[PDB]
Amino acid sequence: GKTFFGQPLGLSTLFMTEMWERFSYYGMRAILLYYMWFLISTGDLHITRATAASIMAIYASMVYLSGTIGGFVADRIIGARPAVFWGGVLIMLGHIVLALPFGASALFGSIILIIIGTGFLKPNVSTLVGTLYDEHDRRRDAGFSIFVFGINLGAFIAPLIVGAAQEAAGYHVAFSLAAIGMFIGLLVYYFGGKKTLDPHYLRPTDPLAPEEVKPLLVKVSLAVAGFIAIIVVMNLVGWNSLPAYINLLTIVAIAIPVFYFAWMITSTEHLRVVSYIPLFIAAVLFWAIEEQGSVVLATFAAERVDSSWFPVSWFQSLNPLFIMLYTPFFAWLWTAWKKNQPSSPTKFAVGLMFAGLSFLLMAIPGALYGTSGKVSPLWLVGSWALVILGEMLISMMSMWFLSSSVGSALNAQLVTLYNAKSEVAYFSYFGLGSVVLGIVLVFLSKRI
C-alpha cells in the first residue's frame, strides 16, 4: 500500500511542514547579517559589525533555548499540533515584520516573534514524527533520518532563492519570500494535518493535574521576577549597552546546563551522569563551530572570496548540501558496518576533530596569500565538507537543543574577536584547540 518512502503517509505532511519552516529560517539567516551591515552603513543602526556578528549568534542561541521548553508546553498545556500551528503563525509574522518598510526598529520585534515561534514548532514537529510510529515499530529510526533530510533540503534551497531575490529586488522582498515560505508550510500542515494525523494530539497528552498548576505558576513567576530584577540592577549600575544584554543572555544560557549537572549530582550512576559531561561539552563546541558558518564564514564569504558571479549568501547552501550528499554513503556505512558500531563517546571526539580541521584549513589561505586579497571559493567548500563530516557522526531533544544553544551562546563572545587582522590566528587556535580537546576525549573515551 501507499507510503512515504516506506513510512506512514503522515510523515509526508510533517516532512513538508518542517522543510518550509526551515526554508523560512535559513533563508532569513542567509541574508540577515548582510542586512545589518547595510543598516549600519546607512547609519540607521548604531552597532559595530562585531556586535552585529554577536547578535547573529545569540539569536541562534535563544531560538534553540526556546525549544527546550516547547515540548513541555505542548505536552502539558496546549497540545503538540496546536503548538506547531501557532508556532508557525508566530514565525510567519516575524518574517512579515522584516518585509515591512521599517529599518532597525523592526529587528527586535522580528527576532522575539521567531524565537517564540520556533520554540513552539521545532521540538513538537519532531515529536509528531515519533507519533506516527508505535513504541515497537522498526521503521522509526528511518523515519527521522528522512525527516532530517527534509530539514536540510529546505535549508539548502532557501539561500539560493532568498539570496538571489535580495540582490535582484532588495531585502524587504527577500524577507517576504521567507514569510511566504512559512505560509506555504502552514497551509500544507493544516489541511494535510486534518487528513493524515491523529487527532489525539490536538490536545495535551499529559495535562496538568489540579494540584500541579499553582506550583508551576510559582516557579515561572520567580524565574521571570529574578530575571527582571537583574535587568533593573544592570541599568542602575550603568551596565546597559547592547553588548551587556548579550552578555546576560550568554550567562543564563550557560548557567542552565551547569546548574542542571551541579545538583542532580547512588554511586551506581553519579559516575554515569558525570560520564556524559564530556559528551555534552563536545557537542557544545562542535555546534559552536558549525553555527559560526552563518557568521564568521559568512563574513569571510562576503569579504575574502572572489565570487562575483553569484550572490555570496549562496555559500550558506553548502552546509545542508553536504548533509544530503553524505546521506547515501553514511546510510551504506551503518548498514554495512554491523560489527563496528563505534562508540558515541569517540563519535563525538572524531566529529569535534573534523570541526577543528575545518577551521585549520581556513587558516591556510590567509597564511599563504595574505589577508588583503581574495581567494578561491573552494576553501569554504573544503571547510564545509570537513565540518559536515563531523555532523553526520554527531547526528532528550531538550538536551540536544540545549547543547546547540550553549554553543551559540559561546559564539556570541567568540565571533567578536574575528576580523581581517585576526583571521589566521582566529582560525588556527580555535581550530587547533578543537582537535586537541577532541583527542583529549580520545584519552578519557573509555576511561568513562
Ligand X SMILES: N[C@@H](Cc1ccccc1)C(=O)O
Which positions lie near ligand X, rule CB under 6 A?
A: 22, 64, 151, 400-401, 404
Q: Contact between 351 and ligand 78M (CB under 6 A)? A: no
The correct pick among 168, 218, 222, 230 for binding ligand 78M (CB under 6 A) is: 230
Looking only at residues 111 through 140 of this chain, which bind ligand 78M when binding is defined by CB under 6 A?
Answer: 111-112, 115-116
> Is residue 124 a contact partner of residue 84, using CB atoms and an 8 Å limit?
yes
Taking contact as CB under 6 A, which single stretch among the options 127-135, 228-236, 291-299, 334-342 is the one that binds ligand 78M? 228-236
Contact call for residues 414 and 291 (beta carbons, < 8 A): no
Q: Which residue in 218, 222, 255, 274 binds ligand 78M (CB under 6 A)?
A: 255
Q: Which three cell numbers stand for residue 226?
A: 529574578
For ligand X, the closer of residues 322 and 418 by Cβ is 322
Pick one of 137, 172, 395, 400: the residue that binds ligand 78M (CB under 6 A): 172
Given 37, 38, 149, 400, the residue binding ligand 78M (CB under 6 A): 149
Establish if 236 lies at the interface with ligand 78M (CB under 6 A): no
Q: Which of 325, 326, 316 is nearest to 291 (CA)?
A: 316
Q: Which residues 6+ apart lie within 8 Å of 424 measured at CB?
A: 363, 366, 367, 371
Residue 57 interacting entry, from ligand 78M, ligand X, none, C-beta within 5 to 8 Å by type: none
- For 94, list phi and psi in degrees, rounded to 5: -60, -40
The answer to whether 23 touches 158, Cβ cutoff 8 Å, is: yes
Q: Is 26 annotated as a binding residue?
A: yes
Q: How far is the CB of 267 from ligand 78M (least distance, A)?
A: 20
Residue 164 interacts, among ligand X, ligand 78M, none and using kind-specific CB cut-offs from 5 to 8 Å, with none
Does 22 appear as a known binding residue?
yes
Q: Does 193 bind ligand 78M (CB under 6 A)?
A: yes
Task: Indicate the residue whose CB is closest to ligand 78M.
Answer: 382
Among 200, 203, 207, 218, binds ligand 78M (CB under 6 A): 207
Which listed range, 22-30, 73-81, 122-130, 336-344, lies at the site for ligand 78M (CB under 6 A)? 73-81
Interface with ligand 78M, residue 368, by CB under 6 A: yes
Q: Does position 26 bind ligand 78M by CB under 6 A? A: no
Rg (CA), the chain: 22
User: Is residue 166 involved in binding ligand 78M (CB under 6 A)?
Assistant: no
Q: Which does 12 bind (CB under 5 to 8 A by kind): ligand X, ligand 78M, none?
A: none
Q: Return all residues near 22 (Cβ < 8 A) that are at least 6 apart.
A: 150, 151, 152, 154, 155, 158
Does the footprint of ligand 78M cover residue 217 (CB under 6 A)?
A: yes
66 binds, among ligand 78M, ligand X, none (CB under 5 to 8 A by kind): ligand 78M
User: Does residue 6 come out as left (phi exceeding 0), alpha (psi in the -120 to 50 range) or beta?
Assistant: left
Q: Which of the listed partners (ligand 78M, ligand X, none) does 60 bind, with a CB threshold of 5 to 8 Å by partner kind? A: none
User: Was 122 annotated as part of a binding site?
Assistant: yes
Contact set for ligand 78M, span 409-428 (CB under 6 A): 410, 413-414, 416-417, 422, 424-426, 428
* Residue 96 interacts with which of ligand X, ligand 78M, none, CB < 5 to 8 Å by class: ligand 78M
Pick 136 or 447: Cβ nearer ligand 78M: 447
* Residues between 291 and 350 that touch ligand 78M (CB under 6 A): 306, 308-309, 314-315, 317-318, 324, 327, 331
Q: Does 275 bind ligand 78M (CB under 6 A)?
A: no
Q: How far is the CB of 300 from ligand 78M (least distance, A)?
A: 13
Name the binding residues: 22, 26, 122, 404
Name the binding residues for L-glutamate: 22, 26, 404
Name the binding residues for L-glutamine: 22, 26, 122, 404
